[PDB]
């Protein structure tokens, strides 16, 4: 059986510790996990825009990943509209 | 480049002269290395000895546009100027 016997070089098999990964996961869930009160940076920076003497929109108005197929159809409909 | 000497392993500062012939390297322990570069070939010309004095800050290197002088700092003794040709 070739599957039972394995030859490995000394430096390659050194990988990330599984115990270390659990430690990182504990920090992530403690600070950004379910149950915390976190908002987005776009929303957090947009609170100032609602109070300005001249109201503006969100700081980053475009959402890149909201839609891609829907974006193309809007352009197609627009071109039709100018006829 | 295929090979490099081992003493360049941890450089604090890397500087090129106005011509591509000479390369200047400062080591993490006090040492200056001048490397002759010609046609993708490297030759270690000279290694300037560590400057006397307590280390105060990270090293900084400056080269004159003629290429004659090299100024290095980072120690309590002061800025040292080396003549590249001599």
């Amino acid at each position: 059986q070739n599957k039972s016997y394995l030859a490995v070089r000394l430096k390659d098999q050194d990988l990330r510790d599984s115990r270390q990964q659990a430690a990182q996961a504990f920090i992530h869930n403690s600070l950004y996990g379910p149950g915390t009160n976190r908002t987005t940076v776009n929303k957090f920076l947009s609170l100032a825009n609602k109070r300005l003497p001249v109201k503006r929109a969100a700081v980053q108005f475009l959402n890149n990943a909201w839609g891609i197929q829907k974006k193309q159809n809007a352009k197609r409909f627009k071109r039709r509209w100018m006829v | 480049v295929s090979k490099m000497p081992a003493f360049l392993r941890s450089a604090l500062q890397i500087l090129f002269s106005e011509d591509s012939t000479k390369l200047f390297v400062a080591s993490n322990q006090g040492a200056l290395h001048i490397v002759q570069l010609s046609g993708g070939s490297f030759k270690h010309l000279h290694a300037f000895q560590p400057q006397s004095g307590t280390v105060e800050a990270m090293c900084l290197l400056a080269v004159s546009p003629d290429g004659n002088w090299l100024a290095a700092s980072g120690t309590s003794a002061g800025v040292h100027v080396y003549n590249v040709k001599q």
């Binding site: 000394l10 098999q13 050194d14 990988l15 510790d17 599984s18 115990r19 | -």
Partner: protein
């Protein structure tokens, strides 16, 4: 009616017939240490080596390439316990060899002294393996270190003992229990971490074998210490 086959490890034999047993030649004929049965061939007596109780026996039956415990060799044995495995090691090294049996437990120490009375090549050391300097007077330079302490910083204990008593080019055999090092992590993850820690000291692990049929979550690592340039 017994037929005896030589084993690949010098000083070790394998016994067939009515019994499927791994055996070693008895250093004290007519005596049984812990109730193991003995067979004679003709003049020569052998003692059965139980793989269920011992871990070195399990490794040998598991197909280990090297054990490095040979006739006329000095062995430092960490975690002697009652001395069941120590008695078989004393058989292999023979009269020329020496075994240093280190055990901290007092109840297991009393069994060692009774065994050490009948075997001249066993030197009992009732001390703590974490402090090799406290027994430096008794141990000269050795060839092989065997560690079976089953205790979380086993690697540091071996390294301290290897620096003081193990010669350049000497070998070590270490048994690792996965759940003792960390109960919640997986066995293969635990074993790889110990391999990393061995490399931090001047220890090069050369092979690794798991003791699946007789134990669970156990591995044996064989390596060299301060290899010659």
């Amino acid at each position: 009616n017994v037929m005896v086959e030589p084993h690949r490890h010098e000083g070790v034999f394998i016994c067939r017939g009515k019994e499927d047993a791994l055996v070693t030649k008895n250093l004290v004929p007519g005596e049984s240490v812990y109730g193991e049965k003995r067979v004679s061939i003709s003049k020569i007596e052998y003692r059965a080596w139980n793989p269920f109780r011992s871990k070195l026996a399990a490794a040998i039956l598991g197909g280990v390439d090297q054990i490095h415990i040979k006739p006329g060799a000095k062995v430092l044995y960490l975690g002697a316990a009652s001395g069941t495995t120590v008695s078989h090691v004393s058989d292999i090294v023979g009269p020329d060899g020496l075994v240093y049996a280190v055990e901290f437990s007092h109840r297991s120490g009393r069994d060692l002294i009774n065994l050490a009375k009948k075997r001249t090549n066993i030197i009992p050391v009732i001390e703590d393996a974490r402090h090799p300097h406290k027994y430096r007077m008794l141990i000269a330079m050795v060839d092989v270190i065997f560690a079976d302490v089953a205790q979380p910083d086993q690697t540091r204990i071996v390294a301290l003992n290897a620096h003081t008593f193990l010669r350049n080019g000497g070998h070590f055999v270490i048994s690792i229990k996965a759940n003792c090092i960390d109960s919640t992590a997986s066995a293969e993850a635990v074993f790889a971490s110990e391999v990393k820690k061995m490399q931090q000291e001047n220890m090069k692990p050369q092979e690794q074998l798991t003791l699946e049929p007789y134990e669970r979550d156990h591995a044996v690592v064989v390596g060299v210490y301060r290899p010659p340039p």
